[PDB]
Amino acid sequence: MGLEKDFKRYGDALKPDTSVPGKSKDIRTTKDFLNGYKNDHAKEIVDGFRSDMSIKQLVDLFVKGSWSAEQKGALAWEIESRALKVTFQNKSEKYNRLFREIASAGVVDAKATEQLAPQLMLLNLSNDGFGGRSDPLSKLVLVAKQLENDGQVGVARQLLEKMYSAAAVLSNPTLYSDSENANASKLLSSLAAIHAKNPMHDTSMKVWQEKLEGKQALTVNGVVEKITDASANGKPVLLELDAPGHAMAAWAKGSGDDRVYGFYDPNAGIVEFSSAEKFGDYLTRFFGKSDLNMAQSYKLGKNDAGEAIFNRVVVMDGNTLASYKPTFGDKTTMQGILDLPVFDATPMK
Amino acid sequence: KKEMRILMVGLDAAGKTTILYKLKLGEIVTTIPTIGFNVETVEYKNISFTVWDVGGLDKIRPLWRHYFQNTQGLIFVVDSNDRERVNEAREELMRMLAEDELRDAVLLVFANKQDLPNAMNAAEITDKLGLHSLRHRNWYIQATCATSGDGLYEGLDWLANQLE
Numbered sequence: 001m002g003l004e005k006d007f008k009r010y011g012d013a014l015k016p017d018t019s020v021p022g023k024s025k026d027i028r029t030t031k032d033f034l035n036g037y038k039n040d041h042a043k044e045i046v047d048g049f050r051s052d053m054s055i056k057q058l059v060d061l062f063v064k065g066s067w068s069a070e071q072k073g074a075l076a077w078e079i080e081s082r083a084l085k086v087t088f089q090n091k092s093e094k095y096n097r098l099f100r101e102i103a104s105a106g107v108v109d110a111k112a113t114e115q116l117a118p119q120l121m122l123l124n125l126s127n128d129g130f131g132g133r134s135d136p137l138s139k140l141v142l143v144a145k146q147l148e149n150d151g152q153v154g155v156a157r158q159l160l161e162k163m164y165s166a167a168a169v170l171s172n173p174t175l176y177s178d179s180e181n182a183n184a185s186k187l188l189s190s191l192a193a194i195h196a197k198n199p200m201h202d203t204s205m206k207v208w209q210e211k212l213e214g215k216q217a218l219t220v221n222g223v224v225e226k227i228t229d230a231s232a233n234g235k236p237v238l239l240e241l242d243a244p245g246h247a248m249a250a251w252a253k254g255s256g257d258d259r260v261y262g263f264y265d266p267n268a269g270i271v272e273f274s275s276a277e278k279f280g281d282y283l284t285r286f287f288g289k290s291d292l293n294m295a296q297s298y299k300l301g302k303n304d305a306g307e308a309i310f311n312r313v314v315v316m317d318g319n320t321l322a323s324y325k326p327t328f329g330d331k332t333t334m335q336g337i338l339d340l341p342v343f344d345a346t347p348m349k
Numbered sequence: 350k351k352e353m354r355i356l357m358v359g360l361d362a363a364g365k366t367t368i369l370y371k372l373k374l375g376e377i378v379t380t381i382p383t384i385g386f387n388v389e390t391v392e393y394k395n396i397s398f399t400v401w402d403v404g405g406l407d408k409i410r411p412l413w414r415h416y417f418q419n420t421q422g423l424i425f426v427v428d429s430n431d432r433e434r435v436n437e438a439r440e441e442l443m444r445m446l447a448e449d450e451l452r453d454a455v456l457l458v459f460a461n462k463q464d465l466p467n468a469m470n471a472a473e474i475t476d477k478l479g480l481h482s483l484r485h486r487n488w489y490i491q492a493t494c495a496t497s498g499d500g501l502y503e504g505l506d507w508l509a510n511q512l513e
């Protein structure tokens with residue numbers, strides 16, 4: 001693929017040899033790049049930019065030039081926008097085919113559900129150039145599933161809908177009220193707050209029961225056994241699954257016939273099954289070489305038997321996570337972040 | 350043998366999600382307003398249709414253009430019983446047909462909810478949407494009731510035949 005080569009050339013040019021160590025501040029975190037990274041901005045600030053350019057031409061423009069961090073952000077938005085435009089439907093189709101095949105096989109799981117909301121595409125539309133919020137989103141989804149276990153309905157579903165709504169608002173700001181624009185921005189700065197004061201670093205509250213790493217790092221089958229364990233039945237199981245550079249979530253909630261087993265990859269979406277067997281099938285084939293091979297694409301390490309392992313699995317304490325307050329001096333909890341509005345009742349402009 | 354990507358759009362409440370799952374699962378599913386999209390692959394004769402059901406609420410209609418990639422067919426679904434919004438449907442259809450990315454897409458209109466009592470019929474929808482004005486466009490209009498499934502495979506059959 002031309003795209004894969006070009007997208008890798010582009011990537012190299014963002015982590016450059018003027019600060020070799022993967023210890024120096026990455027440019028995607030900087031205020032200048034992040035101000036740059038938005039639609040309709042390269043045409044204002046980048047000499048030689050034209051909107052009819054291909055990806056390859058944009059990446060040529062990027063690597064040949066002498067650019068400020070802001071100019072780099074604007075070009076990054078244009079390159080990433082087009083790259084996601086070329087790939088995201090292919091990828092979604094692939095995830096859906098695996099879901100539907102498992103859901104439909106043998107005895108159909110009539111309660112199986114999928115909701116796709118690919119974060120990279122929605123965050124690019126939302127003019128957020130940080131490069132992903134898999135960790136904040138995974139944590140918010142685990143809180144949502146704690147809340148749903150205790151009886152709230154559709155909390156994770158609505159978080160994901162609100163990502164769509166924020167992306168509609170932020171990409172087309174003049175169509176919505178000032179209040180809606182402020183709402184969308186506030187949703188996204190909440191993800192950033194969670195990253196800035198990550199509750200796993202918080203020693204005054206313990207949001208986690210157990211961290212499984214290094215020596216006792218879990219395989220995919222280990223995650224499956226923990227989620228589908230009948231000993232739990234009644235109680236929520238809430239795991240955060242950490243690859244080296246990407247976070248995901250998995251859960252069990254509900255009792256008896258309302259018990260559901262779910263998985264959230266922020267890059268794809270949420271799936272839930274009522275069948276434990278089907279949940280196990282999905283996760284195995286999602287990560288497994290034999291099928292979607294996400295274990296390789298998220299670059300999981302291996303144990304001595306050569307099986308893929310997560311860097312870390314966190315067994316979450318949901319009620320404590322729910323009450324965590326990511327910003328000092330602001331009462332809003334993880335649950336309150338889930339409840340933030342985007343659209344409100346004002347008719348569209 | 351042939352994969353064809355289909356974009357399905359229309360105003361909220363048109364029936365798009367109902368149609369998708371009627372076709373895919375053979376069932377009527379209880380739906381909510383789609384904020385996001387659904388997608389399914391529907392095998393029909395030689396063709397794998399990947400059908401993109403995108404939400405039609407006004408506040409997320411600007412997102413429709415993010416689903417245009419490599420799309421061979423457009424399904425526009427109109428609530429035949431919604432006389433108040435039919436000119437709005439027409440405006441939204443025409444905005445899509447204006448997009449250079451879709452210039453070669455075939456267009457199948459589903460005149461849905463034919464079972465409701467004040468439903469405009471196919472000929473009337475054809476005039477209200479201005480379909481006859483469509484120059485340089487392979488199009489077709491099929492009267493449907495999603496909940497019974499009447500018309501849906503006739504629609505699909507035409508589309509399949511155009512795309513082969």
Ligand SMILES: Nc1nc2c(ncn2[C@@H]2O[C@H](COP(=O)(O)OP(=O)(O)OP(=O)(O)O)[C@@H](O)[C@H]2O)c(=O)[nH]1
Pocket residue numbers: 359360361362363364365366367368380381382383384403404405406461462463464465493494495496497
């Ligand atoms: N009577 C009747 N009801 C229908 C028909 N098709 C769909 N419905 C109903 O109309 C309502 C809306 O249908 P949806 O499929 O959710 O509409 P949608 O186009 O997906 O709407 P958005 O998700 O907002 O874009 C549901 O209650 C459906 O059951 C039909 O042919 N006749």
Ligand SMILES: [Mg+2]
Pocket residue numbers: 365366367380381382383402403404
């Ligand atoms: Mg729908």
